[PDB]
Amino acid sequence: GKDWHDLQNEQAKLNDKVKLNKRLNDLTSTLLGKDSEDDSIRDDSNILDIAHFVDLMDPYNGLLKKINKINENLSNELQ
């Protein structure tokens, strides 16, 4: 029942983490002694770039509204 399911999960996760440990050993050897990404399969720069793009020139927030809320407030405090 649940015991055999737990044993099956154990037998799966053992080979999972020993494969993981071999990958960490390989990367540690690579790092101390010295893998590349030159394709388009899963790259995360797109969403970061877009989220910066919209926040820089947001017509509600952006910079021009912030600079306006700075300088008109300074003019109100001065005049």
Place this chain on the structure above:
Amino acid sequence: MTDTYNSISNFIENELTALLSSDDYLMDDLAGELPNEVCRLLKAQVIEKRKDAMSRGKQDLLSKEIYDNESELRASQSQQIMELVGIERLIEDVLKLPQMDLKVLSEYSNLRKDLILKCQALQIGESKLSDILSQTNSINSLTTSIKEASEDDDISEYFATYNGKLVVALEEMKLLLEEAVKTFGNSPEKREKIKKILSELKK
């Protein structure tokens, strides 16, 4: 069916002969680096503890148990594949079908590989589309933002004249700051002006 178990039994006997030749390989490896009389003595302790460990009945019982496990593995394989004759359930049943009348077997293996490729590319494309959907959502939010902000529907030129509005706002800020510096000259007024300038600039 029983020929499979016969081949398992002959290979088990072959591996036992491999083990005894490996014991002889211990014997002639330890020769030279150890005295041969010491080698014969440790061979004697190997006989009186380790040689009887591979009993004749136990290896055959293990071979029979392995054959029964392989037969029930084949039965389970048949059960899943006959269930598979009849979206994520398809990819699941594909990744649990095993790997293997020579032409049918070769084409089964080849198209099995070519269909694991399709199953993998499925979640590859799914993750890519899940990213691009959020990208287009933010882009559409920005476009409707500038559309109903200016209420002029000329948003293509909005991204071209933003530099001019930016620099004239900076020039007005610079003129106001110069007027405040040359007019007020007070430490608390300058501190308050600097605090108000630096509050909403980044924070």
Place this chain on the structure above:
Amino acid sequence: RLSYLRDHTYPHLQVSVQSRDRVHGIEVLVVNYKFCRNTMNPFEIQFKMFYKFEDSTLLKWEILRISTNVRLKAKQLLATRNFQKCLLSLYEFDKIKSKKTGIFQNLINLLKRKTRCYLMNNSDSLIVERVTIKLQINFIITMPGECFLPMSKISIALWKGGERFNQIDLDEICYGLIKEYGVKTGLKEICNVCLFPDM
């Protein structure tokens, strides 16, 4: 009665009604809602909504004004024509952003001495440079597609100084480290691997 539901049920949320009015059968409500978690730049929202005063039913709901911070972010969200997916998806967004900036600040506090560490984006991406190894931890919160909850996407990117490695294998590495550790100790193990002078 009032005070407990005011604060402890929804911490760092400011609820306040602005105006009430009754017509003839429709009743109109004008209200503002402020999420004051990030007190440096909090964000609020204003709604106008309608009941019957018997079997209170939202006929129509409209946006009067949104604060300057989230007036773009809360527009793609607010096209679903369902408030329970529009105000249970903003508090979670605020809480997720708070946890993101807290995790990044705590990671600054554990690397500001030996290494250098800053934020490339506003709070989304964090860059740590050591020796000349570089690590970048991305924490993307993007709105639901148009489920309904805000979307958090943790990513890593490690350069040895000269070149970038593969993203899929490091993604599996991140999967394992977060899987048996979690978001904080897993990234701590990842930046320990970035150091790797002893451990």
Place this chain on the structure above:
Amino acid sequence: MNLKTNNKKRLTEKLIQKDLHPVLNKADGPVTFRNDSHELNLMLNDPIKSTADVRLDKEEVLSLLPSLKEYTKKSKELKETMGQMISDSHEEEIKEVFV
């Protein structure tokens, strides 16, 4: 039950794997992951499904889907196009001169 106790010592002899830091904390580790996967709504960089002794041929995948080859070049065109539009804004200079 008995085999579970036989497997506990397998866990103990397993957990001394070759790593100084990244295996020395999971001796509430995965339950922390299941606790914060929902609290942050976290589904992270999801690993591609099991290879099953077939190498993950990304070349065959990009051959089978011809759309992504155009998507990546459209994205690169957008990035190279208006990163220069960012560079004409001096947001970093303003943030440096103010805070």
Place this chain on the structure above:
Amino acid sequence: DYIVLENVYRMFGITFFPLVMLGIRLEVFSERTSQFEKPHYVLLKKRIKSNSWFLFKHTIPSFIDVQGIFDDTNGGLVISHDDAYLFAKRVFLQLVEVQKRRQIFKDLEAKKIIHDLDLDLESSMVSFFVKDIKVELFVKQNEIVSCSILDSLDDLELKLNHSFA
């Protein structure tokens, strides 16, 4: 005065009512009928000798568990109210997908494709009549696992009309 304040508190769908103890109140707003669902009350008790919350009374349906999921977060360490909010969010997601399934059934009934129905408490053995062949289906959460024809859950409407003509 206070009445509109409890309406504002109740539109969320997750509320915590103090007691002398706790009570989590859950309601799911329906987009179609423009009305809230039945209020689900979870009266939660704190252990004295263990310093951790545990379930005292529940008004949940038997299909939705409030104990297994309750110990699925933080290893049963539900002392912090953030973990209570996590449990509330998880059971709210389960409630809204179950309500979505029930609304799909009600919409297909209102479309008059089938005859009168008998909906159950678990939305698995919901029976209905078709013009010639009455089909019973064993269905999990948004997934049918058996279609017992004798004479994705939304994808049924993809194919049942195909079976209708």
Place this chain on the structure above:
Amino acid sequence: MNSEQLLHNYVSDSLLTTLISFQEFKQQLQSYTSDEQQLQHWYELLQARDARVTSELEARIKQFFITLRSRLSLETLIDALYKINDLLQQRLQILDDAIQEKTSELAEFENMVRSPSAGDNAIPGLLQIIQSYINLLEEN
């Protein structure tokens, strides 16, 4: 828990270090031989030999396993596998068609927001205004 690690248990308990420890043949070779310090050296030699036989045994075990499973209605599943192959490629065509619309949308947006204008000329004005503001703040 399948048969290959049953073979591994059957070979590991029949390995020499198991119930014949270092102390066992150390006591058995006390007065029998003179190389007492070399007993430890022969012992790590024993671990080395045991260590690479317990790696080369898997080669033959898995070779015979894949040979027997390779030699394992029959032709009925081929038509079903072509049915699945025709199903999934048409299924992925839907995602490809969905991606085409989004990438055309983003390509239209990128040329909609491009501004081939004098950004650098405004950049010098912004830099000059920032320098004047910095000078005023330093004087403040």
